[PDB]
Design an enzyme around this catalytic site. Structure first.
Site, short mmCIF file in Angstrom:
data_model
loop_
_atom_site.label_atom_id
_atom_site.label_comp_id
_atom_site.label_asym_id
_atom_site.label_seq_id
_atom_site.Cartn_x
_atom_site.Cartn_y
_atom_site.Cartn_z
N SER A 146 0.88 -1.21 0.06
CA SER A 146 0.10 0.11 -0.10
C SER A 146 0.81 1.36 0.13
CB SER A 146 -1.24 -0.04 1.00
OG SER A 146 -0.65 0.25 2.26
N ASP A 245 -8.22 -2.90 -7.25
CA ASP A 245 -7.91 -2.72 -5.85
C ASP A 245 -8.96 -1.92 -4.82
OD1 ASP A 245 -5.24 -2.26 -4.02
OD2 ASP A 245 -6.33 -0.58 -3.84
N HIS A 289 -8.41 -5.76 -0.45
CA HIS A 289 -7.56 -5.02 -0.07
C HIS A 289 -6.14 -5.78 0.65
CE1 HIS A 289 -10.07 -5.56 3.51
NE2 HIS A 289 -9.23 -5.99 4.03
O1 SUQ Z 1 -3.02 2.04 3.73
C1 SUQ Z 1 -3.39 1.97 2.69
N1 SUQ Z 1 -4.43 1.13 2.36
N2 SUQ Z 1 -4.74 1.08 0.97
C2 SUQ Z 1 -3.90 2.41 0.75
C3 SUQ Z 1 -3.90 2.86 -0.61
C4 SUQ Z 1 -2.72 3.82 -0.85
C5 SUQ Z 1 -2.00 4.39 0.28
S1 SUQ Z 1 -0.91 5.54 0.26
C6 SUQ Z 1 -0.74 6.28 -1.29
C7 SUQ Z 1 -1.83 7.18 -1.62
C8 SUQ Z 1 -1.95 7.65 -3.03
C9 SUQ Z 1 -0.75 7.23 -3.90
CL1 SUQ Z 1 -0.97 8.15 -5.57
C10 SUQ Z 1 0.10 6.53 -3.79
C11 SUQ Z 1 0.09 5.90 -2.22
N3 SUQ Z 1 -2.34 3.84 1.54
N4 SUQ Z 1 -3.16 2.77 1.56
#
Ligand code: SUQ
Length: 344
Positions: A146, A245, A289
């Site tokens: 993530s 996702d 997820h």
């Molecule tokens: O902790 C969790 N669960 N699912 C997610 C999804 C994105 C993130 S950070 C993130 C946010 C936006 C972008 Cl462009 C790149 C990274 N964190 N996360």
């Protein structure tokens, strides 16, 4: 409870609240493989947003309450049945306590309520590990899920450069980015780009140099999107991404009639398209997820090949495609759970 906590010996490399960052380590003396895993957990992008996170997600902002040990699970497990890929490796879990998608290089100070030091935390963990056996490594796999998966993309080449500059050119640095490959797409109903843009300025966030030079000042947010930063990276990177996702859908405000059907189908096609030129990838057609540190990470297959197998084939490829041992595994079926092995 097999990985043991070490707070950074350089106590100026800190979590958000100024407490020391750290890492959990389980050494495997018979192995020259090192797995450094970046935890995820979103981010925060201004004072008020970070204050809220400090009040109810404090472990993501502080080491004050961290436990002395953690159990390695999934790809961090030392049991071969749970981890067919790298069960004998040296295992490192790096807690995410910088709230900056691993991009920050700013200390807490008179003008800054919080420190955002994610990029520096990775560098300091690597430096301190060199004295604990990493100097003898043959492969350092920087993995993460993530926010940690995006963190791999943003930091793998910097780790490779750091090891070169410190005098360890024989260590092969590679990345495994899980669930960190997003699309800057239109929402289904009415943003990360604005939140990331504000976050980067709040954190003094840093992106990989070649990507920074392409997009230039003010446009560094582009480098948080896998399909834009990946082509600029030199280190080998294996990409794991569900085609549907859950975090992508959440930001897209998707929670089935024709408009939503077409939206979901187009999202999977777009994701699949971004992976066409990613030779080491695992992208199942699932709404999930779930991440690679879960104990049942072995169970999903694409075209009959599990992720631990694909990662093993990737290792072999880095010794022409290999007979029976594929590394590019992207589902082509167009709807969540058209792959029967998707997590339940
Ligand atoms: O902790 C969790 N669960 N699912 C997610 C999804 C994105 C993130 S950070 C993130 C946010 C936006 C972008 Cl462009 C790149 C990274 N964190 N996360």
């Amino acid at each position: 409870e097999d990985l043991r906590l070490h707070l950074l010996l350089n106590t100026s490399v800190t979590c958000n609240d100024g407490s020391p960052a750290g890492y959990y380590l389980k050494e495997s003396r018979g192995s020259r493989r090192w797995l450094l895993f970046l935890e995820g957990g979103w981010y925060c992008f201004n004072r008020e947003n970070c204050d809220s996170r400090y009040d109810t997600m404090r472990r993501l902002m502080s080491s004050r309450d961290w436990p002395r040990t953690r159990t390695g699970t999934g790809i961090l497990s030392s049991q071969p049945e749970e981890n067919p890929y790298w069960w004998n490796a040296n295992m490192v879990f790096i807690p995410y306590c910088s709230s900056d998608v691993w991009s920050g290089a700013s200390s807490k100070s008179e003008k800054n309520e919080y420190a955002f030091m994610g990029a520096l935390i990775i560098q300091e963990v690597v430096r301190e590990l060199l004295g604990r056996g990493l100097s003898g490594a043959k492969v350092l796999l920087l993995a993460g899920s993530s926010a940690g998966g995006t963190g791999v993309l943003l930091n793998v080449d910097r780790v490779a450069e750091q090891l070169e500059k410190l005098g360890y050119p024989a260590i092969q640095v590679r990345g495994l980015a899980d669930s960190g490959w997003f699309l800057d797409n239109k929402q289904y109903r009415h943003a990360p780009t604005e939140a990331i843009r504000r976050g980067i300025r709040y954190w003094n966030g840093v992106v990989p140099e070649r990507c920074r030079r392409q997009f230039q000042e003010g446009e560094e947010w582009n480098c948080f999107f896998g399909y834009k930063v990946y082509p600029t990276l030199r280190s080998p990177v294996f990409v794991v991404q569900w085609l549907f996702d859950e975090a992508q859908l959440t930001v897209d405000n998707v929670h089935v009639q024709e408009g939503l059907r077409l939206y979901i189908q187009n999202l999977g096609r777009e994701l699949r398209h971004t992976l066409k030129d990613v030779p080491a990838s695992f992208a199942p057609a699932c709404l999930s997820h779930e991440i690679i540190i879960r104990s049942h990470w072995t169970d999903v297959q694409v075209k009959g090949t599990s992720l631990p197998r694909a990662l093993h084939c990737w290792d072999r490829s880095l010794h022409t495609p290999l007979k029976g041992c594929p590394v590019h595994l992207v589902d082509s079926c167009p709807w969540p759970h058209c792959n029967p092995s998707c997590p339940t």
